[PDB]
Design a protein around this nucleic acid. Structure first.
Lengths: 159, 82, 69, 69, 82, 159
DNA sequence: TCATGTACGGTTAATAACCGTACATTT
DNA sequence: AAATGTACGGTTATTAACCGTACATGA
């Protein structure tokens, strides 16, 4: 009975034994998300279990962003996104991405937002987002992928 | 001013901070807070500002004006969300 | 090479929040981010001060040379 | 507007000598040189802080927009 | 730190300095001394450094390598000095 | 019985009623030289009388300088120069300029100094220094005049 | 064991901001 | 009389820099 909720003030989650495969995303959980190093620039959402103490098996961070020509236009950027090994290969990684766009879509209804940016550190992450329809940018921006808000509109309208 | 930051550091780092603060006519706390917060604003500004070249900018404009329809895998992920 | 020295800073809520999240973005502990930011700013100030001191002493040579009772 | 307020600075001999002699080069009294330098530096800090505050509040709308329980 | 500077100033100048010092996380004295001494160093270095263009530099070089003989009036001025 | 001496620590001169025709050089005397606003960058010399309290009837300020191509070479710059009306039109102004060259001459024997610069605010000052043999510079440096050390060398060895 | 990051609170010596005071010009 | 530039010294409320303390993790 997994659910997606926002990491609130408390952070009262059981993160003991969390492991996504990449230690950088693990240490970011124990040393930043667990200390509420967020709320003003980074906003975290969490994939949590239905246990009596909810366990965290995934998370992502979102931040308001803007892209410029060098005009200026606002956007949203998905920073980190991690899925615990226990629940990998089950589609939760793409469901979190679907929940990201849902928040972008919800945010776009109140403020102007033209799309969703993501930075692909390695080439597996690049293949992961390219598979979901993200458009990869070129040269200096070759490790950024973009998905427009109007495509997000089609995805939840139709569903 | 109700927050706080506690630090452990080497004798070397403490010494050069003490002497650079004295040179700058600043307390240790002023020198350290100013150095960290000014550097924080740099990290934060690089995190939100996507400086796009003209080809990348055109790809974004193409995605905005001519938005693709979501593929089968992406729609399938949104149905499990719902 | 132990971290045997200490420093505590008392600051506003906004100063600590931008430092906390910038360290989170950089994926560094608060200690690394703050101590590294301060030391490298410290080395820059001391190097600049060292050049200015020797420059000013060079100017003081001309000052003493045109100093004639 | 009268000069009804006051400020006193305790400073090194080197800071006071370079301020005195720079005021002498500029042919301004110590009061003009010091208060003018500080007040236009103050206006620059006030202007930059006002742009930073309004920029930061602009970013906070996007933050609140993506803040959904 | 045995010297001092005393200032009279308007309420307007005093107020904007107090608020810029607060924004900068600095005392009034730190903000004023730093602003005045930084501007002092600018005045002093502009006063001693002569940036010469290529024509003026050549005139100086010509005067150095081929020095003129002092004229009669300048010779006359050094006579009364001695 | 006028004498040229250096403005020392004390400055115990009678400068009451001093006037040189230009209030800017007057106020510089009452508000800077009398406060010892010198010693680190500006050096002042004084034309003084032989009274029981010596009266100041002239002064000049000297500063170490350097000229660059925009290499770097050191020089000396004559800043302000004032002669009281009481003793104007008698040649004391050029004798001070000759005294300026003498300390430059003495300074050049201990440190490298290639010549003497002076800034002529107006063109009367330009005519004053051009008449003594100063070479006027051009364009951005059109209110700068220069006299080389080797010409100063000639002046004092010959006499 | 020990080094370390994060965290809270008390003690004390140092001083920033102020205020009174003074004097000589200048208006 | 009033404004102003320069100048000196005492008072007081604030706090920076230490230091002790605590806990949990990883070497």
């Amino acid at each position: 009975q997994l659910t997606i909720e926002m990491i609130a003030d408390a952070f009262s989650y059981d993160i003991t034994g969390f492991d996504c495969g990449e230690e950088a995303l693990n240490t970011f959980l124990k040393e930043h998300l667990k200390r509420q190093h967020d709320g003003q620039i980074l906003r975290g959402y969490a994939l949590v279990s239905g246990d009596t103490v909810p366990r965290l098996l995934g998370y992502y961070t979102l931040s308001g962003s803007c892209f410029e020509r060098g005009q200026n236009a606002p956007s949203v950027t998905l920073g980190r996104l991690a899925i615990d090994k226990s629940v990998q290969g089950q589609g939760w990684g793409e469901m979190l991405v679907a929940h990201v766009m849902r928040v972008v879509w919800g945010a776009s209804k109140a403020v102007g937002i033209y799309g969703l940016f993501v930075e692909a550190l390695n080439e597996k992450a690049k293949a992961f987002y390219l598979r979901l329809g993200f458009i990869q940018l070129v040269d200096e921006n070759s490790n950024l992928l973009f998905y427009p808000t109007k495509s997000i509109e089609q995805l939840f309208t139709d569903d | 001013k109700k927050q706080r930051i506690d630090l452990r550091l080497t004798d070397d780092d403490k010494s050069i901070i003490e002497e650079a603060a004295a040179i700058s006519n600043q307390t240790i706390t002023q020198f350290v807070v100013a150095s960290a917060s000014e550097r924080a604003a740099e990290v934060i500004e690089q995190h939100r500002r996507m400086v796009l070249n003209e080809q990348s900018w055109s790809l974004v404009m193409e995605a905005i004006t001519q938005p693709p329809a979501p593929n089968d895998r992406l729609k399938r992920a949104a149905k499990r969300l719902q």
